[PDB]
Amino acid sequence: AMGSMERASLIQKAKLAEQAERYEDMAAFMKGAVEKGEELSCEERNLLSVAYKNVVGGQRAAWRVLSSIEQKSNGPEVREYREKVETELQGVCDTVLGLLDSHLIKEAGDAESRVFYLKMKGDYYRYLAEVATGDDKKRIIDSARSAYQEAMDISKKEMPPTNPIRLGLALNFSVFHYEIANSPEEAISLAKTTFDEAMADLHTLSEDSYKDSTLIMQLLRDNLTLWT
């Protein structure tokens, strides 16, 4: 539906949708922009991520309320409605994963773009894994793991330890280990090593970079407090 709209107009409308808190519209504009086929700038990658994170975050919150009511009930209506919300969540994750596969990741050569997209791939497989069961669940968990691990390998070779995308990748992979992979010790070790290696590199930063990196460090420390 966005094929007739100019790329620059889709980006401008995504920014308006964000100001209006219209995140489904924001995500549809950014999907249209990706589908023009050109690579995304740093600001445009952030608009894509913010749009879909807010859409899927509303779905995940609704799914968790519905799944809790269903587990306490355990007619068909709670399970049917939890399944409807689940299918729509799955469809948003499939959409994001499809944009990353066709063709954002294959054209991303710089570390900042490639790490960003592989982190998104890990996040959206992680959201699929939260609602998956059984075996299917195993291959979805391993897809999230594999995307996070490739992002981590690149980030350690190519970015300093205080880089905010490297920090946010390590924060989300630590949450994957704690909440999805049943690996709390791996989650704690990754968050602690990431925090400590960033702390040692803060002396290299400007005032504004120091604020950006310490913000994410405090999220690592908040989880370490929750988990220990």
Interface residue list for ligand Y04 (CB under 6 A): 57, 60-61, 123, 171-172, 175, 219
Q: Comparing C-alpha atoms, which of 109, 106, 110, 97 is closest to residue 48?
A: 97
Q: Please, which of residues 62-121 interact with its own copies by CB under 8 A? A: 62, 65-66, 69, 75, 77-78, 80-81, 84-85
Q: In Å, how far from its chain's centre is CA 149?
A: 14
Work out what residue 171 binds among Cl ion, its own copies, ligand Y04, none; the CB cut-off runs from 5 to 8 Å by kind: ligand Y04
Of 85 and 115, CB closest to its own copies: 85
SS (H, E, C) 16-30: HHHHCCCHHHHHHHH
Of 12 and 149, CB closest to its own copies: 12
Contacts of 228 (CB under 8 A, 6+ apart): 188
Work out what residue 158 binds among Mg ion, its own copies, Cl ion, none; the CB cut-off runs from 5 to 8 Å by kind: Mg ion
Q: Please, which of residues 56-75 interact with Mg ion by CB under 5 A? A: 75
167, two tokens:
């920090």
Tokens 């996040």 belong to which residue? 123
Of 24 and 158, CB closest to its own copies: 24
User: How far is the C-alpha of 70 from the C-alpha of 77, rounded, in Å?
Assistant: 9
Distances (CA, A) of 38 to 1, 46, 107, 113, 171: 18, 16, 9, 13, 29
Query: By CB under 5 A, which span of 6-14, 98-106, 173-181, 214-222 interacts with Mg ion?
Result: 6-14
Instruction: Decide if residue 3 touches its own copies (CB under 8 A).
Output: no
CB nearest ligand Y04: which residue?
A: 57
121, two tokens:
């791939």
Smallest separation, CB 29 to Mg ion (Å): 13
